Amino acid sequence: TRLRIAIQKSGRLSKESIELLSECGVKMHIHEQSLIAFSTNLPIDILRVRDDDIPGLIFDGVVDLGIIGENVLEENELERQSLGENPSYKLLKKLDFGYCRLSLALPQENKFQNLKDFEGLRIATSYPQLLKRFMKENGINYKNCTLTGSVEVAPRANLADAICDLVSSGATLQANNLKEVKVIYESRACLIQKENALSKEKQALVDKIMLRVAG
Amino acid sequence: TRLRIAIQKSGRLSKESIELLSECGVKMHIHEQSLIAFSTNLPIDILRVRDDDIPGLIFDGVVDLGIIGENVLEENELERQSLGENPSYKLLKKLDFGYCRLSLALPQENKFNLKDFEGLRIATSYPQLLKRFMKENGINYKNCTLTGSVEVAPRANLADAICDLVSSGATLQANNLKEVKVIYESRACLIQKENALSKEKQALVDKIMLRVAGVMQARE
Numbered sequence: 020t021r022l023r024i025a026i027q028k029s030g031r032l033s034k035e036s037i038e039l040l041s042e043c044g045v046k047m048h049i050h051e052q053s054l055i056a057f058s059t060n061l062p063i064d065i066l067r068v069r070d071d072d073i074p075g076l077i078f079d080g081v082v083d084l085g086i087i088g089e090n091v092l093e094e095n096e097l098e099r100q101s102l103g104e105n106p107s108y109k110l111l112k113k114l115d116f117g118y119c120r121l122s123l124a125l126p127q128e129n130k131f132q133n134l135k136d137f138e139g140l141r142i143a144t145s146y147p148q149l150l151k152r153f154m155k156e157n158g159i160n161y162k163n164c165t166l167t168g169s170v171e172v173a174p175r176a177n178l179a180d181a182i183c184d185l186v187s188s189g190a191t192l193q194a195n196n197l198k199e200v201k202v203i204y205e206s207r208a209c210l211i212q213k214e215n216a217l218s219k220e221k222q223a224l225v226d227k228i229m230l231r232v233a234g
Numbered sequence: 235t236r237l238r239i240a241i242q243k244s245g246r247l248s249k250e251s252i253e254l255l256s257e258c259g260v261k262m263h264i265h266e267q268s269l270i271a272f273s274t275n276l277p278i279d280i281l282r283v284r285d286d287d288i289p290g291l292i293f294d295g296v297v298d299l300g301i302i303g304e305n306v307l308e309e310n311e312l313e314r315q316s317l318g319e320n321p322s323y324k325l326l327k328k329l330d331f332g333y334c335r336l337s338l339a340l341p342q343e344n345k346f347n348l349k350d351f352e353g354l355r356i357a358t359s360y361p362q363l364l365k366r367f368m369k370e371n372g373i374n375y376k377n378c379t380l381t382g383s384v385e386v387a388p389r390a391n392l393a394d395a396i397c398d399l400v401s402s403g404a405t406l407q408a409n410n411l412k413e414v415k416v417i418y419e420s421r422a423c424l425i426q427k428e429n430a431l432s433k434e435k436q437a438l439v440d441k442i443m444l445r446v447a448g449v450m451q452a453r454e
């Protein structure tokens with residue numbers, strides 16, 4: 020009977036997802052719960068999960084609502100489509116946090132003229148589907164390297180020539196002596212809902228939060 | 235032109251992987267907790283990554299060798315094949331560590347046959363392995379993919395059952411669950427990328443492989 024809302028357990032979106040929910044009247048205590056936190060004033064459960072699992076939890080109808088970045092959402096949507104599946108979700112609201120971009124970057128010392136310079140390069144990324152689609156759209160051939168973390172270290176480790184990296188301030192690129200060369204995707208946080216109809220009580224509650232989110 | 239070997243950075247296989255390399259005569263220094271480390275006596279780069287990335291690095295030819303659990307290798311192979319790709323690798327050796335089992339498990343209070351899983355929501359980090367098993371056995375189910383905290387999903391009423399990886403030497407009694415069916419038995423493996431190596435690198439792999447065999451016999 021309780022609404023299930025998935026949010027990122029720790030990372031970019033965590034703090035502001037919890038802040039948003041509170042401002043919408045959802046009271047809860049976030050301590051170190053491994054998976055679930057229970058709202059103390061409303062019939063709502065907060066599932067604290069790895070960001071990468073949120074799109075799938077929505078697609079699979081496991082949870083009702085989720086707060087997730089467009090990049091993670093689209094990466095996983097593309098993965099599921101490529102498996103021949105039909106992932107679907109309701110977009111409820113584009114949010115005012117989670118701002119970041121996914122960009123091609125090169126070692127500082129490289130002379131870069133064009134996207135054509137990425138031809139035949141090995142490119143390290145945590146977003147292989149998003150990278151793949153961009154490169155196909157622009158007719159550039161390359162070799163993939165999928166790494167879930169430490170992407171920016173790939174060139175120094177001689178694993179890749181270049182990277183496709185999620186960037187906000189430029190600080191981590193600077194630290195790894197890399198330079199942003201081409202933005203391929205721009206992302207923000209979004210609130211989404213599972214496709215299948217909620218029970219009457221649950222949808223009413225969703226409608227109530229959506230009022231205050233708009234608020 | 236240096237041999238690249240990918241191993242788990244930290245987790246179920248990390249210690250045992252670096253130990254196997256030492257046992258085989260590969261000396262190395264680890265100066266920091268970062269992606270790359272190097273052998274001191276041989277022309278080898280040691281890449282320390284998330285386990286889940288190792289199959290892909292091998293399929294994509296990014297590295298030459300990998301040490302990885304069969305479960306993780308098979309999950310990602312199935313994933314890549316289901317994407318329309320043709321993941322390929324050489325299996326060099328099944329190793330003497332990383333023993334673990336992917337098991338359907340239920341809450342201890344539940345009355346458990348496999349058709350008892352029919353229609354249940356099943357949480358897992360290995361959705362392809364689960365899907366394949368359930369299709370082979372004609373049991374319909376609802377998927378729940380979680381990268382972590384799988385064992386908490388039923389107590390959180392997020393799922394009815396789990397398909398969980400359990401280590402040799404460990405049980406689920408503490409988490410209040412019962413293993414019902416092992417669907418996959420796994421150990422650590424040494425694998426190689428598909429495209430031929432240079433003669434020099436292949437020669438070093440051969441030398442390592444002889445040593446691995448001697449090490450495993452001497453450890454029994």
Ligand SMILES: [Cl-]
Binds near residue numbers: 263
């Ligand atoms: Cl040194």
Ligand SMILES: [Zn+2]
Binds near residue numbers: 048050
């Ligand atoms: Zn409290």
Ligand SMILES: [Zn+2]
Binds near residue numbers: 263265
């Ligand atoms: Zn040293």
